[PDB]
RNA sequence: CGACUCUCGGCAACGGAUAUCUCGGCUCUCGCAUCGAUGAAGAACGUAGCGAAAUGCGAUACCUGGUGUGAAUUGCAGAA
RNA sequence: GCGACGGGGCAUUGUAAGUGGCAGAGUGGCCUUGCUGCCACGAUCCACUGAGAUCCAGUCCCCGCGUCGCACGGAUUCGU
RNA sequence: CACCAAGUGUUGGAUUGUUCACCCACCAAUAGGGAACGUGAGCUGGGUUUAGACCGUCGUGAGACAGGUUAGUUUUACCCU
RNA sequence: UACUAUCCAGCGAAACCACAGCCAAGGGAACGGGCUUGGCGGAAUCAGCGGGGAAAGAAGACCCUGUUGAGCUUGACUCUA
RNA sequence: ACUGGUACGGACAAGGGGAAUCCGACUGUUUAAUUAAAACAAAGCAUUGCGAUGGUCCUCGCGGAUGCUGACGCAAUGUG
RNA sequence: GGAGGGCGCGGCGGCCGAUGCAAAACCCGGGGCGCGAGCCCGGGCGGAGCGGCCGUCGGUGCAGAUCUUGGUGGUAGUAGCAAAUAUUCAAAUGAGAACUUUGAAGGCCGAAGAGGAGAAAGGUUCCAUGUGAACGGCACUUGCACAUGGGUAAGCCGAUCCUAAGGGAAGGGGUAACCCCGGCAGAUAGCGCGAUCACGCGCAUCCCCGAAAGGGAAUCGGGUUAAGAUUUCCCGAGCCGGGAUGUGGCGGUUGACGGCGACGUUAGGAAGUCCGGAGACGCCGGCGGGGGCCUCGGGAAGAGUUAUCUUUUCUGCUUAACGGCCUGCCAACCCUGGAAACGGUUCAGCCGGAGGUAGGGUCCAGUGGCCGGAAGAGCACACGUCGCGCGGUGUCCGGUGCGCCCCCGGCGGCCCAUGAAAAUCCGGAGGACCGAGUACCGUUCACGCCCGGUCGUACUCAUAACCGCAUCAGGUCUCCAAGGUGAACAGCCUCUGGCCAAUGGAACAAUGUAGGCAAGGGAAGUCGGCAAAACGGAUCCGUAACUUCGGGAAAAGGAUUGGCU
RNA sequence: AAAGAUGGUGAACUAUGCCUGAGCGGGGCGAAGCCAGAGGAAACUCUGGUGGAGGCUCGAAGCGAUACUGACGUGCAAAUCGUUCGUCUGACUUGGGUAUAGGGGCGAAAGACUAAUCGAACCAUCUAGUAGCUGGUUCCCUCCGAAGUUUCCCUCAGGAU
RNA sequence: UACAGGCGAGAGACCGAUAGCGAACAAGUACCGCGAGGGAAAGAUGAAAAGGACUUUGAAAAGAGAGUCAAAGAGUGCUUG
């Protein structure tokens, strides 16, 4: 198991969009679990890893 | 549609809320009177039929009763004595 | 609206909340012995609780 | 012809009966008088170092003064 | 000895994509103002095209094509 | 008309809940009886026969009716044979 | 044609059960799985099934009785707001 | 106007219709978990008493319904 | 059914025995006795008290009781775990993965959502972290589970404040009394205002609760964490109420002018008292205007198609509360003017004959504009890791209407129906009283200073946090409501938002259940056309005996319906 | 047992009323009124239109449930689900607040309903209520051993004798 | 003269964990119901925790050895079973 269910929201929260809308990159799982808060979520967005679809 | 389930699935109202004297939801709103203990009132609901188990939660069991007691064993209100002071006193006796 | 601020019933659900916590191991020692399997511990899927 | 169906024993598992226990109940008998607006009966919610409960207590909060006894409290920690 | 496809037969349906066309109701728009005017647009029709697509699964065949085909050892049981 | 004979057939509709009944029409023939008045964990639920209701009669009334009329829940097999 | 059933892996009850379970006829609480007499007499079984177990659910709702009720009616008895 | 399909609301969506008879006039209402009906309601029709310190009702008294109305009204246990 | 004679158990008075070197209890296809009730003894198990005999006494012996309570079978590893359109592949992790998690893919709800939130309700369920003993009727490393932590911050939102239907103290009176009507000599019993000065003046049907929906003192934006954010936080800007005041202005015509007036504006006395209006109003219909959403062109950026073709397709393009200046037509009002060949004009005949049409004004300020707010914000890009963040731009300008939603305006229909009240509250009338100049008066004005208490705020809101024992296909109040086809907020498909969990695999038999189709016949079936099935939308044509003349009527019955140009 | 009494408790379901809020897509049909023209000298009467009324009709949301006597009928569910279908601008739908409680309420009336409960709710008490009737009634052996008859009875399911 | 409460005592041919009170144990507790009200189940290792370190298998839970104990045929399912 991976949580990624806290980094599904919080990156909503933050694009305005649904959940269906983020994409999370599927080499860099652990990394994109590893971030945590909303903060770390930002960075990750910036970069492009999280992206939205 | 009709009984049981429909009697359920409604259930919108508030009739018995919590009761401030006796704790217990018994507190009929729209009537503003307990049906446990009176809440307006001017005497506690005490019935004379209503048997064992009932009357027993009436009689309480988070009660103080240990201080009203004391009172009652000494019977008088006095008593004087400050013994235990050095020079030895009268704090060992016999 | 609010969600019932009446203070009578929000203090009985602090209470009943705290209350329904489980029985801390190192008493089970320090009451010589019988099995303290609490019994006030409720959950809110089952049961209900009056005020 | 294993098997199956049945039965018993020996060892068990099941189960909590039985025996033996009982800081409890039960019933009888005896002594005693002694609640409150001077804030009760009853409730609520808190307070223990570590507590859910019971018990204790009330912001002076598992207790205080005073007094008796005369060294423990203990699950561990702790004050010396 | 055996197997999937393909090819050919057998079937089904009905003539594809692409390309060409004074085929085409018509209409625009530029002139070099057209007894073949050109460029598009245009449902649709026709040619190429009884075409294309599918066709063994419970159709048929092959000596085309490659492998499995472990000259099974993997798994197991049986005595008059 | 009588015999051996159940080997093999013995019907469709109209109407009525009616089997029965009574017609139409065929036909070699359209026999009669039984099986928990064969046949509801196979059905249907139309009759009978609940609770709603209308009418008539009887009854002071409530109600009743071998009088009529309508609408009204059909549960369970996986066990053993 | 779907979804089941079926078959699998996992998961997994209940109703119900005196003891059980092959027929025929006889007598018999006057309609037998068992008795009696004949016929019989597959181990171990699955998918089915609706004849039977007068299968199961429901101290028959009907019907009768009880010196048992209750709802109702009244020109009952007896009182009364 | 050309042209296609067995054909053209092509899917999806979306009243079967008529004639009589019995019955309730109607739309409306109800037996909630077997009965939506012809039953219940109903407009309309007929119909009540009390002129008031009285009618009809409650509450044992008071006060209260009707009646912030009061005979083209209000009520008749809401009649038929 | 009676009587008779016994047996066994528990306890008590007597009497005698037995024991950790192994009591009682319990087990025993082990022995023996008695007709039996029962007894005796051995072996095994066991570990602290017990039995026999003589008297005494009972809550004294069980197979049942549709028995009571506990345990356990067969049933049965059997019925089943089948509604909700649906999963699959690869990777990550882990001992282990159809189900977790991520991607890819397929789908589904189809904006009256399986949606984003609030009510009610529950109460921490929200989120992290730990994590599989029980529980998620499969599985499982996952969980709305269990353990461990954290989290809800308000002068402006609600409650509060306020009244309603209504409830209920107080009085009088019944009722012992509980309890019930409800006010009375609060009426020459005191509450309220001046009033600081002690005294005077004025008045009731009181006084509180009662909608966390009525009614209402006052906030917006951005950012943030686990989350709702006007609400937490923060910037910037307000707004209301209370208190203090100082500065400016207001007023010597003592309590402002100008304007034909309607009325205009930074002030422009005002005691008792009065009166009005505001709070303040039904429902339906059509119409007007607005906002947002929808449609669409140009234009500035990024994305896609991109064999092929298409200046094609998609997407960002935003501007607040609050304030300035300006602005609304209907309604209404002022002034001009004097109308017959009478006019404008409503869904009801209404403007004008107590002065219209027409000309010029005025008013209600919904709203838009431009400016302030306010880009310092936000959005889209490029570049940078110079990173918990760096530097730059661009972010604009039009159009269209029976569109959709909501609002707001003024009308119209309805009625034997004519559709609340209060807190809150200003106005006018009222003119007492107080008005001064080197100051006193305004202090409903602007600007400045301070302050604003109490309580709720997590989150779900349901095919899984609510109620039905329950992660139950049920039920449960409300707000937002894209695109097509089409009348459609119908169905169907899709956007946006949300799931992919409906135990999974295999065969896919009969038999079921659910869904279709059948030549020829056409209700002969059946108690009965029960439902399947057909008709169906619309345009045109055609339309009955009868009737309360309104209807039947969409009668019946026919024909028509495309693509495209 | 069915009940009966006494004292209490419920309008959170539902019944109805009051107060205050919400919600009802788009048609069919084509009312009063209004308007033009026409005929008529008049009194008056035609025709084409406008307009959008109704306890009106088709039909979504909502609300209801007619038939299959379907599915299910040890269920998803102590009343659900499918199809078919009634109603859908008013006697409409529905919430909150509020009123009425047990011989009582409420009822457009079914003896219906009043929290899975209604020909008199539920709860506790009186109550350990009563029942000629059904069920069960517990260790052994011995000896003796019946009767369903007479008489009376609101008695003929039972007593007395 | 009374005394089923309260407080503080003495006793019984009382009961022995399905018994005794509803409750020997956190009991009027948990829980049930909208409420009035209804209302459990649940005592025993051993003298002392001496509550099984350590080694090993297993993902873990557990197991197997061992340790401890008079006894694990006493391992918080705990006396007898």
Known sequence: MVSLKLQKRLASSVLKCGKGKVWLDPNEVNEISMANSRQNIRKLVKDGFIIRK | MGKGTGSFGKRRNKTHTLCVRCGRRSFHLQK?????????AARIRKYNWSVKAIRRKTTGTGRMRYMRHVPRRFKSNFREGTEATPRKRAAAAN | ???????????????????????????????????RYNAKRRHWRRTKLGF
Request: with cysteine; net charge positive.
């Open chain 2, 32 to 40: 503003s009177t307990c049906s446990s203990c009176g809440y307006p």
């Open chain 3, 1 to 35: 609206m609010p969600s019932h601020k009446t203070f009578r019933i929000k203090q009985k659900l602090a209470k009943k909340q705290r209350q329904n916590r489980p029985i801390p191991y190192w008493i089970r020692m320090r009451t010589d012995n019988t099995i």
